[PDB]
Write a protein that binds this ligand. Structure first.
Ligand SMILES: NC(=O)c1ccc[n+]([C@@H]2O[C@H](COP(=O)([O-])OP(=O)(O)OC[C@H]3O[C@@H](n4cnc5c(N)ncnc54)[C@H](OP(=O)(O)O)[C@@H]3O)[C@@H](O)[C@H]2O)c1
Ligand SMILES: NC(=O)c1ccc[n+]([C@@H]2O[C@H](COP(=O)([O-])OP(=O)(O)OC[C@H]3O[C@@H](n4cnc5c(N)ncnc54)[C@H](OP(=O)(O)O)[C@@H]3O)[C@@H](O)[C@H]2O)c1
Ligand SMILES: C[C@@H]1CN(CC2(C(N)=O)CC2)CCN1S(=O)(=O)c1ccc([C@](C)(O)C(F)(F)F)cc1
Ligand SMILES: C[C@@H]1CN(CC2(C(N)=O)CC2)CCN1S(=O)(=O)c1ccc([C@](C)(O)C(F)(F)F)cc1
Lengths: 265, 261
């Protein structure tokens, strides 16, 4: 996967057609906003019809070539599959598929909550694969891009986020594998996996409350960096408050081994 | 907290051990090694016929006891009840070896979604259900959980998308609760094993699409048991020394240490 060899410019997204999931609040909403500003066509999804509307309202006043919302729950794969189809039609195609939604989760020890483990895998991982399968044909059409939003909990181990973390790891294994598959079948669709540290979204802040005192990067800048990375067709993006974090969490060896086994066969 | 000493067979003598996916390949070799050590063993798989053969040989090898319960790990009710049944039979549980995986061959992903869901149910979810079910007994014995994984469960390759997803899931979930146990002072060890190619009949058929050296299943099984007995966090086992040394990711353990204090 060849990343683009040039600085990012806002106009790279002008007239592009972008789906953003989990776009009712937090990072997703900010991403939708940023795309508005850049004159993108946008389709946002989430369960809350009401919050979804307010988002769309603002995306239009910000200069969005066109903005729609479609409400529904990614718990339901039939919905997920139909959503992409409806969004495809609402826009006349697709250039970027931003997968951002996660199931409601908070900080607990794993007290055998098997149900929350399964829901996490359905919502946080399985629906992404479904959404992807649905979007590929269109993405092949426009030589487009997939952006998978993930976390530090999706690269290293933390306590209190076992199911969540299981799901984010799943995304890495799966999407990094298909990235190789696309390379060798030469499909020109790029996959960008985003690894995020603490972000000051409402949900996160309430969840870590008093349980851990640590700096949180701004959601606005965070959302912009997810887009840029997706736009320059980078394989991975890293965003945290600390540079210590964002430089250290990258795994240099794994990338070397992978390449070393590609030349071998 | 592992054990600074070397491993000896007698660390297993009379230990009550479950082994899943033990009707063939590495799973079968583990039951075999355990039996040689005088452990109490309960094995499982779908096929009762072959399970019957494993059990018979375990008794031949010196197994303290050797029984089988057949079912499908696609069924989480079975998984749950399997653990309870096995523990009641043996009188408790020392070591849960989780080894089974849904049937897998080498394919490009092809909207193949049913295979992704099943791989996650069988390769991953069922491990969480068996762990939940075994945990009370393991606490009683200060026992250990051994999770079998793969290179593809640590790095990325083509042809094993669903498979990797599930193995990556295993590392994320289990490493996370290992830290949870660490801070709740629950002394049950968790051992993740990272295996490269092993000459298991089933693996040799899925590839042989690619030629590469394969480590012996019999040895692989022992290394997996060793690491569990010793309560090591991770076990690495490939034929090539370059892999078993390069697949390691030291920065990650450094980071996890620095973000815990
Ligand atoms: N914030 C952080 O500190 C942080 C850190 C690391 C990684 N990340 C990653 O960044 C992404 C967004 O995080 P965030 O903090 O911005 O999240 P958030 O504020 O809690 O927003 C989550 C979004 O997902 C939607 N959603 C929840 N359940 C859904 C369901 N069942 N079906 C469809 N949509 C659903 C929500 O809308 P509805 O309620 O209307 O459904 C909401 O728009 C996540 O992937 C997360 O892993 C965030
Ligand atoms: N061999 C390798 O090169 C290699 C490499 C890396 C990692 N590994 C890992 O090592 C472990 C064992 O590998 P292996 O090659 O020895 O496996 P294997 O020979 O193919 O045997 C797999 C076992 O799982 C059972 N099984 C299949 N479907 C099941 C289901 N739905 N429910 C319960 N049991 C089921 C099989 O018996 P039934 O069909 O009768 O149920 C069999 O006993 C796996 O976790 C694998 O990921 C192996
Ligand atoms: C540093 C942060 C926060 N950690 C909190 C932590 C620690 N550090 O020890 C575990 C006490 C969890 C790891 N990362 S994270 O991947 O970015 C991350 C941030 C937020 C969230 C969620 C979903 O909002 C939350 F779980 F909180 F509900 C999940 C992951
Ligand atoms: C070196 C091997 C085989 N690789 C084959 C590979 C390469 N090397 O490029 C990808 C073409 C995949 C990665 N590892 S592995 O993790 O140990 C591993 C071995 C066997 C299996 C299975 C389940 O039997 C199989 F997928 F084959 F059905 C899965 C993983």
């Amino acid at each position: 996967q060849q990343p683009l060899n040039e600085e990012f410019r806002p106009e790279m997204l002008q007239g592009k057609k972008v789906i953003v999931t989990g776009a009712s609040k937090g990072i997703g909403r900010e991403m939708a906003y940023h795309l508005a500003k850049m004159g993108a066509h946008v389709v946002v999804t989430a369960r809350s019809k009401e919050t979804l509307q307010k988002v769309v309202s603002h995306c239009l006043e910000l200069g969005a070539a066109s903005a729609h919302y479609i409400a529904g729950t990614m718990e339901d794969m039939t919905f997920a599959e139909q959503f992409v189809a409806q969004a495809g039609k609402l826009m006349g195609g697709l250039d970027m598929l931003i997968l951002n939604h996660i199931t409601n989760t908070s900080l607990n020890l794993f007290h055998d909550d098997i149900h929350h483990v399964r829901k996490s895998m359905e919502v946080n991982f399985l629906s992404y694969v479904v959404l992807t399968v649905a979007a590929l044909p269109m993405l092949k059409q426009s030589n487009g891009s997939i952006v998978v939003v993930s976390s530090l909990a999706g690269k290293v181990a933390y306590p209190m986020v076992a199911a969540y973390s299981a799901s984010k790891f799943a995304l890495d294994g799966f999407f990094s594998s298909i990235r190789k598959e696309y390379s060798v079948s030469r499909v020109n669709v790029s996959i960008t996996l985003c690894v995020l540290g603490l972000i000051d979204t409402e949900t996160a802040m309430k969840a870590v409350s008093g349980i851990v005192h640590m700096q949180a990067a701004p959601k606005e800048e965070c959302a912009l960096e997810i887009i840029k990375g997706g736009a320059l067709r980078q394989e991975e993006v890293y965003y945290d408050s600390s540079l210590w974090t964002t430089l250290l969490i990258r795994n240099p060896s794994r990338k070397i081994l992978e390449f070393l086994y590609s030349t071998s066969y």
